[PDB]
């Protein structure tokens, strides 16, 4: 209920956040379900906008 | 002074807001992509259209 509270502008920052934590794998595997359980409640809930905004860095982020 | 309408998607629960004021993710009607987290005053549900005098401000908490 406190993760749907944020605007979409922070979600575009939030994907750049997890784009950086993929680089530090020690942060990743030590917090692997919580990173997993947060993207997949956001990108469900903020699906229609992230799929409809076009930005070739976002394709390079999500890959 | 053009006015941009917006349709309500999801009322926000558990956010700590001042009584009387409720917090709502709206969707722009004229372009169904965007969203903006605005506050209402009166009683609001989903699937009703809301009137915005200004688009670009995005309302935060009112303590």
């Amino acid at each position: 209920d406190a993760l749907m509270v944020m605007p979409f502008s922070y979600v575009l920052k939030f994907l750049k956040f997890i784009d950086t934590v993929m680089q530090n794998k020690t942060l990743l595997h030590s917090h692997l379900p919580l990173i997993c359980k947060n993207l997949f409640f956001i990108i469900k809930f903020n699906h229609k906008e992230l799929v409809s905004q076009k930005n070739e860095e976002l394709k390079l982020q999500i890959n | 002074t053009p006015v941009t309408l917006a349709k309500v998607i999801k009322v926000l629960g558990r956010t700590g807001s001042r009584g009387g004021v409720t917090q709502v993710r709206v969707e722009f009607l004229e372009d169904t992509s965007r969203t903006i987290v605005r506050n209402v005053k009166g009683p609001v549900r989903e699937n009703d259209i809301l009137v915005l005098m200004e688009s670009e401000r995005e309302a935060r908490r009112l303590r």
Binding site: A2, V5 | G16, R60, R61
Partner: peptide, 11 residues
């Protein structure tokens, strides 16, 4: 004291 979820956002 901030309400949670907001304090995610400015952090």
């Amino acid at each position: 004291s901030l309400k949670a979820g907001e304090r995610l956002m400015e952090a």
